[PDB]
Amino acid sequence: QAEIEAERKRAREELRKQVAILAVAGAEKIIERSVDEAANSDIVDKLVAEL
Amino acid sequence: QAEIEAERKRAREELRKQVAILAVAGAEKIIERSVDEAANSDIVDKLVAEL
Amino acid sequence: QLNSTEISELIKQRIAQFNVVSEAHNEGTIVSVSDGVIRIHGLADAMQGEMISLPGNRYAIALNLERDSVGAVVMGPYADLAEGMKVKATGRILEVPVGRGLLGRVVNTLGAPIDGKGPLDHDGFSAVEAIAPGVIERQSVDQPVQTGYKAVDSMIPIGRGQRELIIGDRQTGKTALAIDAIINQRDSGIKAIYVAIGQKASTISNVVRKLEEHGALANTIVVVATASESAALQYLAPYAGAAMGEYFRDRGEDALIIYDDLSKQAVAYRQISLLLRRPPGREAFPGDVFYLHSRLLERAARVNAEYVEAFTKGEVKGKTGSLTALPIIETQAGDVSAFVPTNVISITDGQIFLETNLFNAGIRPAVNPGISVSRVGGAAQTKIMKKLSGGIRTALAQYRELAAFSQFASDLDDATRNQLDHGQKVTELLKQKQYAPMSVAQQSLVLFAAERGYLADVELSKIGSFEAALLAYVDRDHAPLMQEINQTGGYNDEIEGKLKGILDSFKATQ
Amino acid sequence: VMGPYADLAEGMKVKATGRILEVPVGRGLLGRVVNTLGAPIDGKGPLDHDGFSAVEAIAPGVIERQSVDQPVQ
Amino acid sequence: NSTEISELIKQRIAQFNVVSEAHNEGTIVSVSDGVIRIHGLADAMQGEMISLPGNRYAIALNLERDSVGAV
Amino acid sequence: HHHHHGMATGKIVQVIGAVVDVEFPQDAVPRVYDALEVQNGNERLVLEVQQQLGGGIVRTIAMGSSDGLRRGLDVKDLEHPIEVPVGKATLGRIMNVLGEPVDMKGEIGEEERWAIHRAAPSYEELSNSQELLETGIKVIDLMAPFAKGGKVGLFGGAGVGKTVNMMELIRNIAIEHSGYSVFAGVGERTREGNDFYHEMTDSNVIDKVSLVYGQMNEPPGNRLRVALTGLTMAEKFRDEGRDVLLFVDNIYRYTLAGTEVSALLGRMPSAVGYQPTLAEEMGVLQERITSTKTGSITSVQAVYVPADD
Amino acid sequence: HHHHHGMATGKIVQVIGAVVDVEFPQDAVPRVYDALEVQNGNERLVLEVQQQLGGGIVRTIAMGSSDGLRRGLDVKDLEHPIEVPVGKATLGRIMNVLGEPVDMKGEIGEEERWAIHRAAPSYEELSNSQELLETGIKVIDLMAPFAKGGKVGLFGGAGVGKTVNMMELIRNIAIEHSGYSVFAGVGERTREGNDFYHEMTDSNVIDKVSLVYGQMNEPPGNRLRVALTGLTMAEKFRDEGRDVLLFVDNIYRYTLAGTEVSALLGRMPSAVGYQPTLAEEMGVLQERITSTKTGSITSVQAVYVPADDLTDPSPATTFAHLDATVVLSRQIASLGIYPAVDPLDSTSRQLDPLVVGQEHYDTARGVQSILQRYQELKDIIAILGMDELSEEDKLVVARARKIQRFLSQPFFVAEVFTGSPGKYVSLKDTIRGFKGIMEGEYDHLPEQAFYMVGSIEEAVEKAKKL
Amino acid sequence: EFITVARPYAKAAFDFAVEHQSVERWQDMLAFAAEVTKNEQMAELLSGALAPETLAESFIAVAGEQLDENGQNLIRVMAENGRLNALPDVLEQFIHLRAVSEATAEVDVISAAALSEQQLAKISAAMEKRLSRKVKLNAKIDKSVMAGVIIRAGDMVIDG
């Protein structure tokens, strides 16, 4: 039983990590808005500067 | 073994509460990372409005 | 909740920021593949044998660079995608998690991941390819190991690193075997893995079930290998797992591993050869075996100290490295030559064979009595084990040889009868039940049984068993002190006496 | 090859028959002597079958069948 | 394939125009273990011995189109 | 396979019989498992895996018939392969390999459509419990136990009236449980089949289970293909979280079909001319059966016993 | 040694495995074996020659590790197509296949160098002599004569004790020296190797000889090369000493590598996937063996018999090229007999009765007859059991199990395997055995006694107790 | 598309081209040729015939006489080769051939490929980079570098 409890820590933690990863996806979609927001050719010009 | 088990399921459920709850904290963090990651320009105004 | 911290950490790793390179780099477009192998373009100059990143992060196995283009062999899903894509490629071929820190954990064989915890710690990538350790630097090793099978231990002693043949036979308990013997090592003092070729879910599962059942499964680990597993993973895998032991072995520590059913690897690798389109040999065979085997077989060692000082980079300042491991040999239809098994046998330092009859006869032990042996021998046999234990090795054949008698009329009297009975009974005695760990103490009891025969003729078969159980028991009450002896290496004439008085002393028993 | 291959030679242009495998089907011609390619082997000059029938064939649904108790001599 | 010269192609590049030179002795392009792809000695006699560096003479049975070799 | 509009043409490149050389657009092509259909005179025709070849042309095959070829040829490419409309209605209803309601058509409406190509592994997925199947067999079961979702070998034969055994299973499934399974014959004397249909009427229980049958009148591409079908179909019921076991046909028929494929593949056969990878196929097969955490898949099979070698 | 300056390069043409596909200048030209250098990132590597391919591109070979190489790579070359230092200083320390001192001792060795190619004596050149050798070999020394300079053949795959029976070879070899000789082993196991090294130390015999020893897991290119190591190795000695002796290993591996590479060359295999020139290679290797008027040499040789297929054309070239040879019975082995050789099998061309006198030839013939007989009826029994045994026959049979059982004796050095020691043997005593056995002289003699047993006197002492 | 087969042919090319110094001229010949090859109604006819002479003649015949004697004897090589069917590939090779000597081109970064003749990697390259001033054009660049950095990024998310 104790071991099982450990496993539960592992799996629960894992689901948390999944919610974390899916969470990461949605974060990335919002990041698509972070591109949709505050996007300037100037920023590109900064990339150009990275030359 | 069963006895341990029930409480286990419980720990799961309360965890689920702390989960939906933490969804706030997550939305926060994700936003933050979206700025830091953008590594470009900081605009906090837009509201992604994501669960 | 708690993991929110973890999110923070990940934000810190994530703070590693970024850079870019290789706007063209090597790349090129993989022209056409059947089943992992592709007409493939780009990336001309790579270090031979490099691993090549792919969709779903897959390295590629490309043995052949033509003057013009090349071709490669995938691991993982074959059908994933359409052809002609640009090429992604790993810096280092043969890069796999290193350090021993993580342990006793279920991984993909190939991949790190498996149930339930993927998260693990790896000191760095590793590569299966290796060069032979200096033969000059080798430690002949007296470390005995412990069968936990009653007479089996007797049959052969165990030093670390010997090429260890088991036979194996279908339905034989071979999948069973004794592989349990890790329990015999409750205190391991070395880590082992085991390997299971194309193995069955239910099997792996049950092993799992039992896995902590005996207790700590973490103590050592093994790698996941399934039927679906591709000769990338499959033909390639046992080879893959090798470099692991370079943790302890390269930490200069002995370590053990079991693998068998390697035959799978052969037609596995042969289906490979159909790709090679090269002509195979008998049984679809190339000689890669040797290379393969040499690659494979060459692994185990025990080594010189200063050798380790090197191997330690002087860190461990020459701590004698060792390596242990176990093989086993399938019997399809119990045929001696068995071609390859001939070949392997040739390689082998030692031999185990099974006797179909016994377990077929139901006999709890089935091992083939002198049909097979360890050429290494009893160098580590306790001067008690060593000293007292000889006669069986030969005499067994005798009874068997004597078994040869074909049951003629009463003759030779005790020469015949006594020997044979003594043998047969002795066998019943020898029989060890499944899932029964042997005791070093038991060895004593064992060796004691006939040191002489203080009991030899005393009882009948049933009475032999019964009386025997009685024996083992009466002693505990009888003596504690054996612990020291048990702790001790033994073979003291004085001990022999104390044993002698204690020895007839059981007459009080029944 | 069909028939007396040996005679022929190449660059012969080409002669195309849409049909394939068609041999006169019918009950008309019964009992006659027939070469492989044709009935013609009969001394009989003509032969009457309803019309050309083709070699490719499709078996009927196993479902539809007659169990048969017809003994045979 | 058998052509393979490329350098004599340079030769043959325009020399496809003009050849008309039959040596008794042509160069032996490449060899394996006494047998050599070779070209020259334009005239052929089946199973003719063929002198060599050193006394040795060789022979080839197979009439081989456009080039031949022997051991 | 496609969510289908267009799906284009190609041309028919080189054709010997089932060998399908044909070419699609230069841009792209669907997976070998993925597949495409072309109306040839009377009907559309879809050919099996192309394997990899050039110019949009690659190598393909079909169980159907090849007559009436045309050099230039055009096939509308199906995309998401093998989607197939099973439904629970199938039990007691019979279709062709295509799901074509082969028999007197039960007309067989179906809301499920899925590729049979679906993998069915998952690590740790199935239950760890190891339940036995309880047959109520006075000797078979009593004399010997039965494990839930377990594979089962068959010895017996003609004159065994194995169908008697089967019917026993019929009363056994319903009677024992709600769970209901179906098996399908392939590569087999037809009369047996129809007689078994009648025998189903006599049995009358046929409703619970139904199958297309191979009968060996057919081309291999079909045949070898059939397995994935049943795979998906029961995959309804074990997917239903229901649990079951189906009988199985002569394997040697099946694997051997493997070789005929490999010669067809032009590939070097395995030794003794097996399918050079035939083991792999077995991987498919044996690998398929499982008692899921939520479902149980058992089965029995009788393979053509070859000389008892 | 001398630069070896510049020379530019072939660029690496194509990656075929270890097969070397690379392309050099038009003028750049080798021999069928010639000296090429190239530094890997790590180190200079070399690929031995190509046969002949065009475009400055030819193939080539390597003892090294192919992986981790970049294409088009420039490649260096050495003048001396092959250069093998020939010293007599060598007997101290072993060396790499490169001859790099395999012992920890660095060795200046010697400047004189050699190359793979070597050649045979004239028709008249060698010497032919009958001098022979006899030893504790229960039979074979008895069962067969051994002339001086003779190359002894080993039969069998291993597991036969081929390493442990080979270990007997060590023993008797070890047993008698009275000269200078050297043998080595390659593609072979270390536990043995390091053991022979430690025990060699203990022996401290190494002064007399050193031998580079090749390893089982070693790369092929070396393995192939090892023969040249042999020949050159001899060449110094044969020049140097008139006389020599040695032993030979894993020549199965020889075949094995060789075939292995054949199609790799883009060649079609000889039959059973052998290599097409394999025989030519063999006439090469055995041909490498020689003993001359100026000097003669002895050695004994072993190739793993693949699988006891006697039809093995490998085994064909064996007997064909065979000089001396021996055979072993996995029944006799399986009989649990420690010695375990196929006696009925093995034979001595040198055996001559005139040489042997009649008594030898005769008696041996007789035993042979017995064998013929027991073999002969062996059937009839197995069928019928013995119930019908003709008296005389029955008697012979007794003599039979007895005689087989009889051959076996202990060996002094043998106590390792079985704690039991043993002893050297005396031929005359054997001759006696011939009679008494022929007599069946001891009528009451115990069968069990005879096995692994001492002399008729000793077996008479047993006989007393046993 | 053996195309590797090109070299011995293709190679002698540059050399003849070197030696003949035609490469302007030879280049012309190649242009002309690939053109000729392209002809599809011709192409059907093109594998039609066995007699090599027939094709050398007919091909050379309708050709419009851009041909050279070295290219006549030599074209006769390719036909004698019989391999000639695939010839146009060599031009590609020939390009590289011509290119090989002194040439340079460019890979679009995220937009369009300058193909600038700049022989100093990362230098003459850099010269072009700086030379932007072509810095104007978007041409999908932003989606590309943002999405690609984003790709490394989500890549790290996976890594996270």
Ligand SMILES: Nc1ncnc2c1ncn2[C@@H]1O[C@H](COP(=O)(O)OP(=O)(O)OP(=O)(O)O)[C@@H](O)[C@H]1O
């Ligand atoms: N002599 C024996 N005593 C006790 N159990 C035995 C004996 N022989 C076999 N078994 C049992 O066989 C069972 C499973 O054996 P196993 O599954 O290994 O047969 P198998 O070895 O799988 O087939 P194979 O022998 O081909 O691997 C185990 O329970 C093991 O205990």
Ligand SMILES: Nc1ncnc2c1ncn2[C@@H]1O[C@H](COP(=O)(O)OP(=O)(O)O)[C@@H](O)[C@H]1O
């Ligand atoms: N005279 C002998 N008596 C008993 N065993 C022997 C004898 N000769 C060889 N052997 C056995 O041969 C076994 C195999 O050792 P090894 O020589 O490697 O065999 P091989 O070389 O044939 O593989 C050894 O364990 C050894 O006991």
